[PDB]
Design a protein around this ligand. Structure first.
Ligand SMILES: CNC(=O)[C@H]1CCCc2sc(C)nc21
Lengths: 244, 178
């Protein structure tokens, strides 16, 4: 992540991120809705940061420093480029919606009144098809990626030294190769929890309550489709095992 | 320092996310309680041994039977949560969660944890439950369930008051080590 965005999301909540004199001007219900919206963006920034560690630090680091067999690096980080593109675009729109909402003369005081429209766009049409396609593929290759990681760490000395070296910094404490893969898989199921709590505090405007209710239903339809398209791939799985 | 993986399982309103947050922050959030928990790596020293314990949640994964098991690979200790203000969450333990945890995590120790023990003395809790011919889960009922399912142990805590939270994770570390 970039420093501009890290500072905007360093606070534990929206009520702590905005100026105290700006906060005082708002009703409690707005503050509560804004806190959950801030959490949705902050965790999306962290999710995008996880995907950059997988592509730039791990994947590219392995390609430019190790002599692994062709196709090994793809098996360790499946669909990471497609995933990073999907989520960097969604984060871009979330951050642009916050920036348009800033008060003049301020880089921290904002209120997001419209969010449902953006969530309906993300979880509908071709963007929903690409997320469904990419997560079904990713989550079916999850087990095979972990097993491949365990084989390489146990047998190759240069792979073990590479991993120990790039994950040694404290900022990487909870971001190893296996942690990144579970962090990515778990992400999709966090959206209905976040959207339902935003909806809980968005009854003031009827259009907003309806857009969020639609977006919630779209996310659940996507999660149900991803879940139905999953079948764990095994390295060296015979055909007889697959069709039985 | 060895690396151990803990996964917390349980029904939606069992309070598992709140338990992980209060432990990871090491206090009850005063300004905003987060909706979600990503992950955390705890630095714990139990009985002289230093362990790096990775903390994970299954929250949001309850209706997704093919997504949920992806949280189980390489687990060293399972926290099986239920809410003391919800006797129906305890009934789901032996027929819903226990068969799943034992298939995907064979031989892994399970600690049955009763959350929200503070609500055992809440008057609104007792009144709401009596309207459905119910009462808060008694300590002996929790121990009997932990015994019936073959749990490593039975523990109780209150994430709101922080009571018994440090002890559940120190014990989980010990179970992961055996
Ligand atoms: C998203 N569902 C919830 O119940 C929200 C609303 C109340 C406050 C909290 S704390 C938590 C883990 N979720 C919620």
């Amino acid at each position: 992540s970039m420093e501009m965005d890290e500072k905007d999301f360093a606070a534990d909540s929206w009520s702590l991120a905005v100026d105290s004199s700006f906060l005082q001007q708002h009703k409690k219900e707005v503050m509560k809705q804004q806190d959950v919206i801030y959490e949705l963006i902050q965790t999306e920034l962290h999710h995008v940061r996880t995907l950059k560690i997988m592509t730039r630090l791990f994947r590219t680091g392995m390609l430019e420093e190790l002599h692994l067999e062709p196709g090994v690096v793809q098996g360790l980080f499946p669909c990471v480029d497609e995933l990073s593109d999907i989520h960097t675009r969604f984060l871009s729109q979330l951050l642009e919606r916050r920036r348009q909402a800033l008060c003049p003369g301020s880089t921290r005081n904002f209120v997001i009144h419209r969010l449902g429209d953006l969530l309906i766009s993300q979880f509908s049409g071709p963007s929903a098809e690409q997320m469904c396609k990419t997560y079904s593929e990713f989550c079916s290759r999850h087990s095979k990626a972990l097993k491949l990681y365990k084989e390489l760490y146990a047998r190759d000395k240069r792979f073990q030294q590479f991993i120990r070296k790039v994950t040694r910094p404290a900022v990487l404490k909870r971001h190893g190769v296996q942690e990144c893969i579970l962090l990515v898989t778990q992400r999709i199921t966090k959206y209905p929890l976040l959207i339902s709590r935003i909806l809980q505090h968005s009854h003031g405007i009827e259009e907003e309550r309806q857009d969020l209710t639609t977006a919630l239903g779209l996310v659940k339809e996507l999660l149900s489709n991803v879940d139905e398209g999953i079948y764990q791939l095994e390295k060296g799985a015979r055909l007889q095992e697959i069709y039985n | 320092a060895i690396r151990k993986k803990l996964v917390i399982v349980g029904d939606g309103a069992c309070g598992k996310t709140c338990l992980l947050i209060v432990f990871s922050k090491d206090q009850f959030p005063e300004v905003y309680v987060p909706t979600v928990f990503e992950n955390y790596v705890a630095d714990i020293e139990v009985d002289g041994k230093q362990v790096e314990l990775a903390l994970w949640d299954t929250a949001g994964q309850e209706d997704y039977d093919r997504l949920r098991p992806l949280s189980y690979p390489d687990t060293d200790v399972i926290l099986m949560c239920f809410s003391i203000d919800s006797p129906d969450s305890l009934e789901n333990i032996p027929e819903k969660w226990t068969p799943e945890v034992k298939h995907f995590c064979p031989n892994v120790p399970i600690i049955l944890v009763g959350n929200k023990k503070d609500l055992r003395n809440d008057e609104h809790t007792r009144r709401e439950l009596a309207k459905m011919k119910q009462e808060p889960v008694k300590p002996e009922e929790g121990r009997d369930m932990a015994n019936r399912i073959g749990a490593f142990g039975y523990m109780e805590c209150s994430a709101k008051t922080k009571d018994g939270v440090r002890e559940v994770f120190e014990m989980a570390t010990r179970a992961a080590l055996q």
